Design a protein around this motif. Structure first.
Motif, PDB file in Angstrom:
ATOM      1  N   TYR A 131      39.188  21.830  86.517  1.00 37.00           N
ATOM      2  CA  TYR A 131      39.536  22.462  85.267  1.00 37.00           C
ATOM      3  C   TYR A 131      40.521  23.598  85.530  1.00 37.00           C
ATOM      4  O   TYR A 131      40.471  24.198  86.588  1.00 37.00           O
ATOM      5  CB  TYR A 131      38.299  23.121  84.680  1.00 37.00           C
ATOM      6  CG  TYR A 131      37.252  22.093  84.278  1.00 37.00           C
ATOM      7  CD1 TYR A 131      37.263  21.459  83.036  1.00 37.00           C
ATOM      8  CD2 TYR A 131      36.273  21.701  85.193  1.00 37.00           C
ATOM      9  CE1 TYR A 131      36.287  20.520  82.671  1.00 37.00           C
ATOM     10  CE2 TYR A 131      35.310  20.743  84.868  1.00 37.00           C
ATOM     11  CZ  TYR A 131      35.317  20.145  83.607  1.00 37.00           C
ATOM     12  OH  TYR A 131      34.333  19.219  83.310  1.00 37.00           O
ATOM     13  N   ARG A 132      41.367  23.939  84.567  1.00 39.21           N
ATOM     14  CA  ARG A 132      42.334  25.072  84.661  1.00 39.21           C
ATOM     15  C   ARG A 132      41.643  26.466  84.718  1.00 39.21           C
ATOM     16  O   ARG A 132      42.057  27.381  85.384  1.00 39.21           O
ATOM     17  CB  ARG A 132      43.330  25.046  83.427  1.00 39.21           C
ATOM     18  CG  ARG A 132      44.497  26.024  83.574  1.00 39.21           C
ATOM     19  CD  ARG A 132      45.479  26.022  82.412  1.00 39.21           C
ATOM     20  NE  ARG A 132      46.220  27.281  82.192  1.00 39.21           N
ATOM     21  CZ  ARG A 132      47.340  27.635  82.843  1.00 39.21           C
ATOM     22  NH1 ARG A 132      47.872  26.871  83.775  1.00 39.21           N
ATOM     23  NH2 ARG A 132      47.925  28.805  82.591  1.00 39.21           N
ATOM     24  N   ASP A 133      40.576  26.629  83.965  1.00 41.52           N
ATOM     25  CA  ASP A 133      39.828  27.850  83.858  1.00 41.52           C
ATOM     26  C   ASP A 133      38.413  27.584  83.372  1.00 41.52           C
ATOM     27  O   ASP A 133      37.981  26.476  83.142  1.00 41.52           O
ATOM     28  CB  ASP A 133      40.525  28.811  82.895  1.00 41.52           C
ATOM     29  CG  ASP A 133      40.700  28.210  81.539  1.00 41.52           C
ATOM     30  OD1 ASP A 133      39.821  27.621  80.930  1.00 41.52           O
ATOM     31  OD2 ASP A 133      41.955  28.224  81.155  1.00 41.52           O
ATOM     32  N   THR A 180      40.597  21.917  79.563  1.00 41.68           N
ATOM     33  CA  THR A 180      41.708  21.233  80.203  1.00 41.68           C
ATOM     34  C   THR A 180      41.393  20.903  81.626  1.00 41.68           C
ATOM     35  O   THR A 180      40.858  21.712  82.393  1.00 41.68           O
ATOM     36  CB  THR A 180      42.949  22.160  80.122  1.00 41.68           C
ATOM     37  OG1 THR A 180      42.636  23.486  80.585  1.00 41.68           O
ATOM     38  CG2 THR A 180      43.173  22.341  78.637  1.00 41.68           C
ATOM     39  N   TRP A 237      50.097  21.664  86.457  1.00 39.65           N
ATOM     40  CA  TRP A 237      49.820  22.801  85.567  1.00 39.65           C
ATOM     41  C   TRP A 237      48.358  23.293  85.729  1.00 39.65           C
ATOM     42  O   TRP A 237      48.064  24.511  85.780  1.00 39.65           O
ATOM     43  CB  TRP A 237      50.121  22.442  84.072  1.00 39.65           C
ATOM     44  CG  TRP A 237      49.931  23.570  83.030  1.00 39.65           C
ATOM     45  CD1 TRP A 237      50.742  24.672  82.852  1.00 39.65           C
ATOM     46  CD2 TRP A 237      48.965  23.642  81.953  1.00 39.65           C
ATOM     47  NE1 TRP A 237      50.357  25.426  81.785  1.00 39.65           N
ATOM     48  CE2 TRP A 237      49.245  24.834  81.213  1.00 39.65           C
ATOM     49  CE3 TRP A 237      47.883  22.820  81.538  1.00 39.65           C
ATOM     50  CZ2 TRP A 237      48.428  25.244  80.141  1.00 39.65           C
ATOM     51  CZ3 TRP A 237      47.095  23.212  80.446  1.00 39.65           C
ATOM     52  CH2 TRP A 237      47.361  24.404  79.749  1.00 39.65           C
ATOM     53  N   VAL A 238      47.438  22.327  85.768  1.00 34.55           N
ATOM     54  CA  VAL A 238      46.040  22.600  85.943  1.00 34.55           C
ATOM     55  C   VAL A 238      45.732  23.133  87.331  1.00 34.55           C
ATOM     56  O   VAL A 238      44.930  24.042  87.486  1.00 34.55           O
ATOM     57  CB  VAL A 238      45.169  21.380  85.667  1.00 34.55           C
ATOM     58  CG1 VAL A 238      43.700  21.542  86.154  1.00 34.55           C
ATOM     59  CG2 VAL A 238      45.187  21.030  84.164  1.00 34.55           C
ATOM     60  N   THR A 239      46.334  22.581  88.344  1.00 35.91           N
ATOM     61  CA  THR A 239      46.005  22.978  89.718  1.00 35.91           C
ATOM     62  C   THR A 239      46.834  24.076  90.257  1.00 35.91           C
ATOM     63  O   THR A 239      46.619  24.466  91.381  1.00 35.91           O
ATOM     64  CB  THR A 239      46.194  21.797  90.701  1.00 35.91           C
ATOM     65  OG1 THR A 239      47.533  21.353  90.685  1.00 35.91           O
ATOM     66  CG2 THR A 239      45.237  20.669  90.363  1.00 35.91           C
ATOM     67  N   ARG A 240      47.822  24.505  89.501  1.00 39.92           N
ATOM     68  CA  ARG A 240      48.742  25.524  89.942  1.00 39.92           C
ATOM     69  C   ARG A 240      49.517  25.082  91.170  1.00 39.92           C
ATOM     70  O   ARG A 240      49.809  25.904  92.033  1.00 39.92           O
ATOM     71  CB  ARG A 240      48.129  26.923  90.071  1.00 39.92           C
ATOM     72  CG  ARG A 240      47.457  27.324  88.765  1.00 39.92           C
ATOM     73  CD  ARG A 240      46.462  28.473  88.869  1.00 39.92           C
ATOM     74  NE  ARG A 240      46.161  29.028  87.532  1.00 39.92           N
ATOM     75  CZ  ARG A 240      45.205  28.639  86.721  1.00 39.92           C
ATOM     76  NH1 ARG A 240      44.401  27.688  87.069  1.00 39.92           N
ATOM     77  NH2 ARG A 240      45.016  29.220  85.537  1.00 39.92           N
ATOM     78  N   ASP A 242      51.992  25.317  77.986  1.00 43.84           N
ATOM     79  CA  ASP A 242      51.615  26.654  77.644  1.00 43.84           C
ATOM     80  C   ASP A 242      51.750  26.945  76.204  1.00 43.84           C
ATOM     81  O   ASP A 242      51.099  27.852  75.648  1.00 43.84           O
ATOM     82  CB  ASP A 242      52.455  27.722  78.350  1.00 43.84           C
ATOM     83  CG  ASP A 242      52.101  27.779  79.787  1.00 43.84           C
ATOM     84  OD1 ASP A 242      50.945  27.634  80.196  1.00 43.84           O
ATOM     85  OD2 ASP A 242      53.158  27.965  80.541  1.00 43.84           O
ATOM     86  N   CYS A 256      42.075  17.762  85.114  1.00 45.05           N
ATOM     87  CA  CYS A 256      42.650  16.616  85.726  1.00 45.05           C
ATOM     88  C   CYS A 256      41.722  16.123  86.831  1.00 45.05           C
ATOM     89  O   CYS A 256      40.922  16.876  87.399  1.00 45.05           O
ATOM     90  CB  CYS A 256      44.087  16.861  86.228  1.00 45.05           C
ATOM     91  SG  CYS A 256      44.165  17.743  87.800  1.00 45.05           S
ATOM     92  N   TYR A 279      51.097  17.735  84.143  1.00 44.75           N
ATOM     93  CA  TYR A 279      49.866  18.359  83.684  1.00 44.75           C
ATOM     94  C   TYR A 279      48.913  18.629  84.844  1.00 44.75           C
ATOM     95  O   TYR A 279      48.283  19.661  84.894  1.00 44.75           O
ATOM     96  CB  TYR A 279      49.147  17.509  82.637  1.00 44.75           C
ATOM     97  CG  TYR A 279      48.010  18.202  81.891  1.00 44.75           C
ATOM     98  CD1 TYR A 279      48.235  19.093  80.837  1.00 44.75           C
ATOM     99  CD2 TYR A 279      46.685  17.865  82.186  1.00 44.75           C
ATOM    100  CE1 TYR A 279      47.173  19.611  80.082  1.00 44.75           C
ATOM    101  CE2 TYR A 279      45.605  18.367  81.453  1.00 44.75           C
ATOM    102  CZ  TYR A 279      45.858  19.235  80.393  1.00 44.75           C
ATOM    103  OH  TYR A 279      44.786  19.715  79.691  1.00 44.75           O
ATOM    104  N   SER A 280      48.856  17.736  85.836  1.00 39.13           N
ATOM    105  CA  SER A 280      48.034  17.977  87.017  1.00 39.13           C
ATOM    106  C   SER A 280      48.508  19.197  87.802  1.00 39.13           C
ATOM    107  O   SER A 280      47.716  19.992  88.335  1.00 39.13           O
ATOM    108  CB  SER A 280      48.176  16.775  87.889  1.00 39.13           C
ATOM    109  OG  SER A 280      47.517  15.728  87.212  1.00 39.13           O
TER     110      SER A 280
END
Lengths: 225, 228, 228
Positions: free
Chosen positions: A106-108, A113, A162-165, A199, A115, A159-160
């Motif tokens: 998860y992103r947070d 959100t 974005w989620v994993t930085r 974002d 992946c 998106y992956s």
């Protein structure tokens, strides 16, 4: 960040496997990489959410209120379970990197959100690795490469990251049917244009979701008991 | 002239009163007939012109073929089955929620001709008809739940209006049911009769029937052979 | 140069005389080959621009995959089983009615290159080729029955001409059978060779072939590996 997940859903991420029933429980109501293309779809003109967008939105809300999700592409999925390991090995052998498994990220803490990477690479990249159902689609990728790969698939890869930085991702294919040349891949670099889209739009989607749940009397998370 | 059970029974050997939605008889009684579920095709129009649209030709061939074979294939058996299974659940939750009483009504023909008919999901104590969908996907239930009326696709409106045309009622309830919903699994609206639709039916339908009669004669069949 | 059984035998190990439609070899012999039923895709054009249409690129990929894997996925299975079930009865009935006598013709290549072929439903006493379908829906059957020629889908037309192009013939039978029809379950027409079409294959086909060739070389393959 297991404690959070655990506290939140009573599931222990470590024990999870792509396909695990939990695997599935954890995705319910969640905006995932495989489906984000829908969220960012834009009307040729106007502000009106395209159809594929309203539809995904409607699918997501139901996962929340019913606690289930219907099954799709049974045979495709099955094909993949079937060959993933071989694909993995080869990819490695060939790419030169070592791949390791990644539960679900998860992103947070909001957990809205996420992946599910196909692997985490020794050189720091994530891995998306498909075993297309039709050799026709492998050919398409193999010959056209990058510009062959679909938009829905580009959104997924982005998106992956974005989620994993993360900064780069492998996008690979495997086909056990090809007499030779059965594995093909490319490396995709993080693109800030996509980043900025997520974002901007993703949070807006989440808020509408909540408004709708509110209108009918549910609250995000009920799906997890 | 007015349709009677007596007429159906003598022409087809079937006892309407014993018919139940989905029955074998229920299916036979629909062969060759223009039903609310499909009328949308009949009234379809080309952007310009007078040419019958593909969907339209297509349903025409479909109806004809039911006449000359006396059978009909099945489609999306799964959804069909789903809708057929949850219907009773839906009815009784609707009665509770709306507060009305519902009675069952097989099939209803517009006249003694047996060319036009509908199969209401019920007949209400307040005189309104009832249409209950059990969407196969919850996504669809959510769509209506949140979007209401305007959410409901044209095909649905035509279906609802035709049911009123055939039965001569003034309004109709349209509901959705989802057994998978933890709570709130029933939602519904009321649709009022619309003259603009009545009229359209009145003009177009009769003509569609004639074309059919012409085509069947041409291959030597007569409407009705399906009930032999 | 012309094709002969010796070539095939020598190049693939198979006895062409022994082949039956739907045989394992029958299928083997079709791998990588542009057939009559698929040609519509190769001939497809964009409303404007010289860019290939989606269906074209797709078929194109499909065929390349056939070359590099040496296999082909199973498709439209229900439809194939249906036709498989009725082909006999359909033939017999066609014969009676048309008067012609019909003979089997497995598969035929346009030439020694083995790039182009067809698999006719039969060969007719009058030297006409035969395409005999058992449509999956009665609706399509009705479509043709009533509208004849001008009712036949483009694709079917392409398939027809392609067959004359391959076999070098002047006319072909296009017929349909529907065991479901209580009466009149057979209807057919006679299609004449069309030069506008010949020209078309004559032009396009070859370019399509060149392109497959480029593509395969780009990944280290050569046509025919499928028969190794």
């Amino acid at each position: 960040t297991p404690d959070i997940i655990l506290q939140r859903t009573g599931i222990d991420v470590r024990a999870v496997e792509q396909g695990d029933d939990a695997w599935h429980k954890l995705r319910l109501g969640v905006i995932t990489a495989s489906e984000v293309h829908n969220v960012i779809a834009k009307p040729r003109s106007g502000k009106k959410w395209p159809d594929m967008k309203m539809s995904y939105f409607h699918t997501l809300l139901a996962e929340v209120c019913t606690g289930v999700a219907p099954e799709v592409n049974a045979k495709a999925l099955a094909w993949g379970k079937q060959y993933e390991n071989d694909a993995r090995t080869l990819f490695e052998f060939t790419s030169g990197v070592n791949v390791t498994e990644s539960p679900i990220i998860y992103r947070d803490e909001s957990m809205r959100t996420a992946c599910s990477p196909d692997g985490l690479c020794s050189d720091g990249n994530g891995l998306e690795l498909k075993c297309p159902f039709t050799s026709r689609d492998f050919m398409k990728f193999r010959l056209g490469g990058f510009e062959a790969i679909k938009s829905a698939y580009m959104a997924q890869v982005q998106y992956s990251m974005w989620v994993t930085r993360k900064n780069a991702w492998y996008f690979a294919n495997y086909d056990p049917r090809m007499k030779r040349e059965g594995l093909h891949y490319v490396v995709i670099e993080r693109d800030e244009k996509y980043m900025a889209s997520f974002d901007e739009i993703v949070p807006e989607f989440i808020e509408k979701m909540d408004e709708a749940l509110a209108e009918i009397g549910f609250v995000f998370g009920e799906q997890w008991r």
